[PDB]
Design an enzyme around this catalytic site. Structure first.
Site, PDB file in Angstrom:
ATOM      1  N   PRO A   1     -10.313 -20.704 -14.934  1.00 56.58           N
ATOM      2  CA  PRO A   1     -11.545 -21.338 -15.428  1.00 56.58           C
ATOM      3  C   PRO A   1     -12.557 -20.297 -15.886  1.00 56.58           C
ATOM      4  O   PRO A   1     -12.919 -19.388 -15.133  1.00 56.58           O
ATOM      5  CB  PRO A   1     -12.056 -22.125 -14.214  1.00 56.58           C
ATOM      6  CG  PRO A   1     -10.869 -22.255 -13.304  1.00 56.58           C
ATOM      7  CD  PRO A   1     -10.068 -21.010 -13.515  1.00 56.58           C
TER       8      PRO A   1
ATOM      9  N   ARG B   1       0.798  -1.217   0.000  1.00 51.62           N
ATOM     10  CA  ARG B   1       0.000   0.000   0.000  1.00 51.62           C
ATOM     11  C   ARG B   1       0.834   1.273   0.000  1.00 51.62           C
ATOM     12  O   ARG B   1       0.339   2.318  -0.434  1.00 51.62           O
ATOM     13  CB  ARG B   1      -0.939   0.007   1.213  1.00 51.62           C
ATOM     14  CG  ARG B   1      -2.085  -0.980   1.093  1.00 51.62           C
ATOM     15  CD  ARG B   1      -2.777  -1.215   2.423  1.00 51.62           C
ATOM     16  NE  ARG B   1      -3.956  -2.061   2.268  1.00 51.62           N
ATOM     17  CZ  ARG B   1      -3.917  -3.375   2.105  1.00 51.62           C
ATOM     18  NH1 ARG B   1      -2.770  -4.034   2.065  1.00 51.62           N
ATOM     19  NH2 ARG B   1      -5.060  -4.046   1.977  1.00 51.62           N
TER      20      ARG B   1
ATOM     21  N   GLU C   1     -18.904 -23.755 -13.555  1.00 52.58           N
ATOM     22  CA  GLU C   1     -18.705 -23.178 -14.880  1.00 52.58           C
ATOM     23  C   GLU C   1     -19.719 -23.708 -15.886  1.00 52.58           C
ATOM     24  O   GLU C   1     -20.189 -22.957 -16.750  1.00 52.58           O
ATOM     25  CB  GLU C   1     -17.281 -23.449 -15.363  1.00 52.58           C
ATOM     26  CG  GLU C   1     -16.212 -22.779 -14.515  1.00 52.58           C
ATOM     27  CD  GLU C   1     -16.342 -21.266 -14.503  1.00 52.58           C
ATOM     28  OE1 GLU C   1     -16.737 -20.693 -15.541  1.00 52.58           O
ATOM     29  OE2 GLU C   1     -16.053 -20.653 -13.456  1.00 52.58           O
TER      30      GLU C   1
ATOM     31  N   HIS D   1     -10.329  -4.534  -8.229  1.00 52.44           N
ATOM     32  CA  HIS D   1     -11.553  -3.976  -8.801  1.00 52.44           C
ATOM     33  C   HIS D   1     -11.583  -2.456  -8.725  1.00 52.44           C
ATOM     34  O   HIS D   1     -12.215  -1.809  -9.571  1.00 52.44           O
ATOM     35  CB  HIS D   1     -12.774  -4.566  -8.097  1.00 52.44           C
ATOM     36  CG  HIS D   1     -12.866  -6.056  -8.187  1.00 52.44           C
ATOM     37  ND1 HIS D   1     -11.944  -6.897  -7.599  1.00 52.44           N
ATOM     38  CD2 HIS D   1     -13.768  -6.860  -8.799  1.00 52.44           C
ATOM     39  CE1 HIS D   1     -12.274  -8.151  -7.843  1.00 52.44           C
ATOM     40  NE2 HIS D   1     -13.377  -8.157  -8.567  1.00 52.44           N
TER      41      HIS D   1
END
Ligand SMILES: *[C@@H]1O[C@H](CO)[C@@H](O)[C@H](O)[C@H]1NC(C)=O
Ligand SMILES: *[C@@H]1O[C@H](CO)[C@@H](O)[C@H](O)[C@H]1NC(C)=O
Ligand SMILES: *[C@@H]1O[C@H](CO)[C@@H](O)[C@H](O)[C@H]1NC(C)=O
Ligand SMILES: *[C@@H]1O[C@H](CO)[C@@H](O)[C@H](O)[C@H]1NC(C)=O
Ligand SMILES: *[C@@H]1O[C@H](CO)[C@@H](O)[C@H](O)[C@H]1NC(C)=O
Ligand SMILES: *[C@@H]1O[C@H](CO)[C@@H](O)[C@H](O)[C@H]1NC(C)=O
Lengths: 596, 195
Positions: free
Chosen positions: A328, A151, A357, A487
């Protein structure tokens, strides 16, 4: 010809040209992720650029049809999704600045390295270097070093970029007639023009906060129990009434408390259900795993996988020279082409991932009949929620015994049930306050309720209050700890993981009732139940053609997100946690810090 | 039996015509032996209307018309009397009282070149719905709005679109060859019969 008739013909021309160009881009993207070469990078970029340019041209042409004069809602949905400007509403200068900020933050995050002191050469990346520390290390100082260095050396680089990122994103959202960039993101749940099924963007904030109030009792007892177990492992580092140090939570940010299981396991003498040895004892391969997954969906009335699925998918690691991206994924290239990319190993985790999946594939095959612009989940949380409930049933002992992987003599007692539910709560329940608090911070930053000189001050006040987590090192306004998560520095909405979590237990509770399941909800297996499969398929085939409130009503019977099924799933643990905390302090004080 | 009806060309041609310009062949003055049809290809969607297939050798007709073309897997079901869609409406439409047979079989091997077999087009737009047993090979630019077109434009579209046949597609999108046999007996004595 009316404007609505011209739009129906325009969308008719768009569907046929988009399906071809989207297939070219998806096939070129597949050939790279299965054969990482330099020639495949360019062919993926060339095909991807032609597909991106086609959408930008069609978006401008779609904006020549006024939505107010269209009354067919199915046509309006396809025009509205195609007319979405996005970054194309800003000036060419500001959009070029915004794309440069986005690429730099993604480059800083993916290339940011931290070098151990006294060796400027022994450096570690986040993946796998720092992530291995935050997920396996029990050393307080080693975890503190990885948490702080990530950080202070990578997050500080993102702080000036993220300030200009908020300004340009707010200018983009306000030019698209939104309040701010956070209100822009909340448009994914918006529904208009459908009486009894409408949903406003501001309603998501109230529903997320209202359902989160009901999660607090379960999370506080999970938080209190975890703190007590961690306090026995680190007696001089953890206060019995304070928050949890941020670097002792199982990963780089505490997004999941999964790795805390070894130190917080209730009954550490009863082993987990690991049918991995049984799969190797029976000479199972990757095709056997996906064949068993195929039999699962068939048992509930869903179609089998296409012949092109078994022929075109990559269900094993190519190995040796040919390299591939082993993450995946489920591919819907369109025009009847459905594939799954996965470096499958003969383990129980890959067995459950195959069911997760292939659930995405069943979703894609169901709404494949919809128009091109309506081939997606009802909202951002639907697709991942459908995949989660498949691994829920496939992991139960009832299912594992019916397929020959778990011994029939293996009996399940309430001590293994608590061990399973505690492991589940560390991942599922432990991430809900993390997700809500993170997304609320970004909502307030975009809305303008947090000044720049108080970004990190408000970030950790909300970590202490909402998440019950305290920073181990004081951070001034030169830091940018939210951007230290993927994100946030890669511009992805995060509330999808909160809504998806509540959706999946609404789905599971509804399908298990259709399957006539008796007993606790967590032991349910919807296998061999065509009634549950029919009730789920009635929503899968909808795609985006109907409001998500109506799609949710086809499965659970309710029009809105509900937290009660989530609490019904964890009730055997919640009653056990309250009994364990009878001589412990439940709650946390926000003023304590490990550096106080 | 010395003059077998030339079914060796209809069901074994090197390439079939596009659906919008479907090819028509007339079969007459010959002995028709349908028993060899199953030997031509592994028929997938054999279907006869107004006549029992097992009695095809026991009937006579004045003339036979074979309409051959290539469509997608989804559009095979559109080849039927009273059906609607794209092929049945703007490309090739059968009469409501249609009598004859339809033979559709997969041709994934011959009509998929791995780079797009764009030689097979179909009509996307038309001013009105096609009359039964009519061919519209016209290539005039289609007008969707009110402004004059005289060429391609924002609301002026090419009526024909090219199929993107490739072997990687599913069974629903792989090309299917279709031959529609229509039996006709107006006045003349039937020159076509069985063995
Ligand atoms: C992967 O790329 C290499 C590099 O040209 C090539 O030799 C190989 O045949 C490719 N494999 C596949 C499966 O396409
Ligand atoms: C809307 O248009 C579609 C074709 O684009 C049509 O199938 C559907 O019936 C129409 N719905 C209404 C309510 O008009
Ligand atoms: C798109 O942007 C233009 C200006 O660039 C604006 O006038 C229009 O309303 C926008 N439309 C949508 C659907 O965002
Ligand atoms: C799915 O199963 C049916 C039998 O129920 C079979 O006829 C069909 O060929 C199977 N599909 C594939 C793609 O194998
Ligand atoms: C489902 O049915 C199959 C046979 O069709 C059987 O072998 C299996 O044990 C059943 N599983 C459950 C959970 O009922
Ligand atoms: C499990 O059940 C037994 C009785 O069957 C009870 O004595 C024990 O306390 C229970 N343990 C837990 C953890 O629920």
């Amino acid at each position: 010809s009316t404007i609505e008739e011209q739009a129906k013909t325009f969308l008719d021309k768009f569907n046929h040209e988009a399906e071809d160009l989207f297939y070219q881009s998806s096939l070129a993207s597949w050939n790279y992720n299965t054969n990482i070469t330099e020639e495949n990078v360019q062919n993926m970029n060339n095909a991807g650029d032609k597909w991106s340019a086609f959408l930008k041209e069609q978006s401008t042409l779609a904006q020549m049809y006024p939505l107010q004069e269209i009354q067919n809602l199915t046509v309006k949905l396809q025009l509205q999704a195609l007319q979405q400007n996005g970054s194309s509403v800003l000036s060419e200068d500001k959009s070029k600045r915004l794309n440069t900020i986005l690429n730099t933050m993604s480059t800083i995050y993916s290339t940011g390295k931290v070098c151990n002191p006294d060796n400027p050469q022994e450096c570690l990346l986040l993946e796998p270097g720092l992530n291995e520390i935050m997920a396996n290390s029990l050393d307080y100082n080693e975890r503190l070093w990885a948490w702080e260095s990530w950080r202070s050396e990578v997050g500080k680089q993102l702080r000036p970029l993220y300030e200009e990122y908020v300004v340009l994103k707010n200018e983009m959202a306000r030019a698209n007639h939104y309040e701010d960039y956070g209100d822009y993101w909340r448009g994914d749940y918006e529904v208009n023009g459908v009486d009894g099924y409408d949903y406003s963007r501001g309603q998501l904030i109230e529903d997320v906060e209202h359902t989160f109030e009901e999660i607090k009792p379960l999370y506080e007892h999970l938080h209190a129990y975890v703190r007590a177990k961690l306090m026995n492992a680190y007696p001089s580092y953890i206060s019995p009434i304070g928050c949890l140090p941020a670097h002792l939570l199982g990963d780089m940010w505490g997004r999941f408390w999964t790795n805390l299981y070894s130190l917080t396991v209730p009954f550490g003498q009863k082993p987990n259900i690991d049918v991995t040895d049984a799969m190797v004892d029976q000479a199972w391969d990757a095709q056997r795993i996906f064949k068993e997954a195929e039999k699962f969906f068939v048992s509930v009335g869903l179609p089998n996988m296409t012949q092109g699925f078994w022929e075109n998918s990559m269900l094993t690691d190519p190995g040796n020279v040919q390299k591939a991206v082993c993450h995946p994924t489920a591919w819907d290239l369109g025009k009847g082409d459905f594939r799954i990319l996965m470096c499958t190993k003969v383990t129980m985790d890959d067995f459950l991932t195959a069911h997760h999946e292939m659930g995405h594939i069943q979703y894609d095959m169901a709404y494949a009949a919809q128009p091109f612009l309506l081939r997606n989940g009802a909202n951002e949380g639907f697709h991942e929620a459908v995949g989660e409930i498949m691994s829920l049933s496939a992991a139960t002992p009832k299912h594992l015994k019916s397929i020959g992987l778990l011994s029939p003599d293996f009996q399940e007692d309430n001590e293994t049930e608590i061990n399973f539910l505690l492991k589940q709560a560390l991942t599922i329940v432990g991430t809900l306050p993390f997700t809500y608090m993170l997304e609320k911070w970004r909502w307030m930053v975009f809305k303008g309720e947090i000044p720049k000189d108080q970004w990190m001050k408000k970030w950790w006040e909300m970590k202490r209050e909402i998440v019950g987590v305290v920073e181990p090192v004081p951070h001034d306004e030169t830091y940018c700890d939210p951007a230290s998560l993927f994100h946030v520095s890669n511009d992805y909405s995060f509330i999808r993981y909160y809504t998806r979590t509540l959706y999946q237990f609404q789905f599971q509770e509804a399908l298990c009732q259709a399957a006539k399941h008796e007993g606790p909800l967590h032991k349910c297996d919807i296998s061999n139940s065509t009634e549950a499969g029919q009730k789920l398929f009635n929503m899968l085939r909808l795609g985006k053609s109907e409001p998500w409130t109506l799609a949710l009503e086809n499965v659970v019977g309710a029009k809105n997100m509900n937290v009660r099924p989530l609490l019904n799933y964890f009730e055997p643990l919640f009653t056990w946690l309250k009994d364990q905390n009878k001589n412990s302090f439940v709650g946390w004080s926000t003023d304590w810090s490990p550096y106080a | 039996v010395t003059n077998l009806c030339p079914f060796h060309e209809v069901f074994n041609a090197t390439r079939f015509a596009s659906v919008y310009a479907w090819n028509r062949t007339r079969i007459s003055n010959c002995v028709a032996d349908y028993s060899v049809l199953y030997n031509f290809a592994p028929f997938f969607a054999f279907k006869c209307y107004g006549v029992s297939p097992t009695k095809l050798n026991d009937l006579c007709f004045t003339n036979v018309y074979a309409d051959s073309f290539v469509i997608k897997g989804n559009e095979v079901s559109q080849i039927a009397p009273g059906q609607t869609g794209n092929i049945a409406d703007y490309n090739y439409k059968l009469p409501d009282d249609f009598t004859g047979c339809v033979i559709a079989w997969n041709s994934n091997k011959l009509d998929s070149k791995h780079s797009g077999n764009y030689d097979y087009w179909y009509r996307l737009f038309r001013k009105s719905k096609l009359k039964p047993f009519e061919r519209d090979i016209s290539t005039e630019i289609y007008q969707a709005g009110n402004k004059p077109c005289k060429g391609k434009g924002p609301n002026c579209y090419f009526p024909l679109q090219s199929y993107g046949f490739r072997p990687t597609y599913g069974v629903g999108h792989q090309p299917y060859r279709v031959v529609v046999l229509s039996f006709e007996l107006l006045h003349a004595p039937a020159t076509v019969c069985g063995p």
